């Protein structure tokens, strides 16, 4: 009946990713007697990073350690020796060279597996694995020490020049500067190339298979978007989010995915459900965003079919 079934499998984001996209915190794992939220999505999120607001310090910068103030650091593993992050592709392939399985992994799964080898806070019994960001431009895997992805409050964060040691205001985004980044949970699957979305589909419009025909998605929210990248950005902004008081308390920090308060321990789930898909009309520059899994393609030459998971730029 439907010629699109196997083709369309990777766009069942609830099934193939199974966690937030915007904010992925779809599992909890204990570290030193406390449950912490952490990324658990099985697909790579292409073009995702974290914007730190009112700040020149980028999120792939190592977290603040020692004499450094909070706002002077980013989200990434600090430079200790032996140096685990950032690790380049060739360094990772050399590091795992006697492991036939790991050495032959694609760069994204390799990065996710490397990050997943870090033990959190000296808790060897812990299922908690740090997320990572792979940069395809410089071929570097960056392990993320901070697994929080959004902290935005006129009370939850400080926005100042002088206040150097106060808490980050931050949000997830597909910025142009993040175009070569992929955000990687511990759960990123082996075969994400087969089962996960990557490139946007030219000459294609997502539809629903109804009575032997591919019909339009019944409910669509339409927004202007000058190009494909802008549409992917908007879809990401509306996508499944595992994000959740008057102040940023310890419990509120845990809920946002925070684990540590200055080298010490701090003491919900979408499951992939959300506005994860967009149909981009290249002609009218309209981004048609929806929240039901698509089951077929309408072949319309004005359309590119995009996903919150998909690369912001790449087309096939």
């Amino acid at each position: 009946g439907n010629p699109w079934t196997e083709y369309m499998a990777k766009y069942d984001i609830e099934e193939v990713h199974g966690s937030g996209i915007r904010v992925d915190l779809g599992e909890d794992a204990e570290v030193a007697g406390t449950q912490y939220r952490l990324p658990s999505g099985k697909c790579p999120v292409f073009g995702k990073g974290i914007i730190i607001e009112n700040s020149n310090t980028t999120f792939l910068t190592p977290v603040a350690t020692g004499n450094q103030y909070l706002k002077d650091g980013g989200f990434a593993f600090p430079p200790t020796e032996p140096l685990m992050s950032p690790m380049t592709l060739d360094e990772m392939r050399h590091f795992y060279k006697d492991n036939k399985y790991v050495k032959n992994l694609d760069e994204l799964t390799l990065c996710s597996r490397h990050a997943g080898n870090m033990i959190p806070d000296n808790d060897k019994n812990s299922n908690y694995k740090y997320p990572a960001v792979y940069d395809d431009k410089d071929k570097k895997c960056h392990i993320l020490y901070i697994a929080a992805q959004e902290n935005n409050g006129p009370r939850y964060c400080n926005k100042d020049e002088s206040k150097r040691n106060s808490m980050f205001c931050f949000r997830p985004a597909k910025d142009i500067s993040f175009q070569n980044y992929t955000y990687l949970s511990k759960n990123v699957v082996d075969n994400w190339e087969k089962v996960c979305p990557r490139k946007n589909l030219q000459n294609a419009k997502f539809g629903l298979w109804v009575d032997g025909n591919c019909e339009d998605i019944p409910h669509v929210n339409e927004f202007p978007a000058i190009d494909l990248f802008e549409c992917n950005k908007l879809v990401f902004e509306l996508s499944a989010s595992d994000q959740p008081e008057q102040h940023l308390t310890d419990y509120e920090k845990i809920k946002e995915g925070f684990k540590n308060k200055n080298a010490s321990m701090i003491k919900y789930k979408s499951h992939g459900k959300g506005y994860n898909w967009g149909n981009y009309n290249t002609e009218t520059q309209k981004c048609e965003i929806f929240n039901v899994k698509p089951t077929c393609l309408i072949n319309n030459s004005s359309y590119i079919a995009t996903t919150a998971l998909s690369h912001p730029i790449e087309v096939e």
Partner: antibody
Amino acid sequence: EVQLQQSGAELLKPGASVKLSCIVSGFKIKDTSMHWVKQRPEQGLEWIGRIDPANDNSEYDPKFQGKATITADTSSNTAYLQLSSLTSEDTAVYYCTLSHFWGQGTTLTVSS
Amino acid sequence: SIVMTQTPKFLPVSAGDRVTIICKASQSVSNDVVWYQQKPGQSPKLLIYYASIRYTGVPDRFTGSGYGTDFTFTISTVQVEDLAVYFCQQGFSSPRTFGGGTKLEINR
């Protein structure tokens, strides 16, 4: 944070046997080969062997077959080098490596 | 066992001159050669891996090249602090033999 911690300096009589340890902290050893390398006073580096901790397959230079026994423990993320029938030629610094990352070495003195 | 013949054993060099170290494999080791630096009293540190790739943190003055049997390690302009023993190692097949090493001497 990843650290390698090698056991303390050892002094043993000839004919004895020693078990040296290499404790890795902050990292899961399962995916990475633990190598042991020997360096005698003022001499070069000699590869002793390596273990695949995921499958307990350890291999050696034929010079060390019968001398060295390399084990690994993925539970405690520790690698071991046992040396048997100790000899003055066994007097050396013994380095463990977490893949291409080297420990600080353990000095073994074999002497009566 | 593949023999890695490392020459020269001892290399006197002045600050700012070229250090060339050669390591010959008795059997073809593809591109799987690493170069280590051992400063006095310290553990060996990886400078070059897969014959020609500079590790992160390793200064631009350090390079390697070669494929098959013949491998070259170069310090383009030695600095006094480069005083060390340098070792090649093949990783292509076990035993993973080291070259004999090259001891630098800074001319003064």
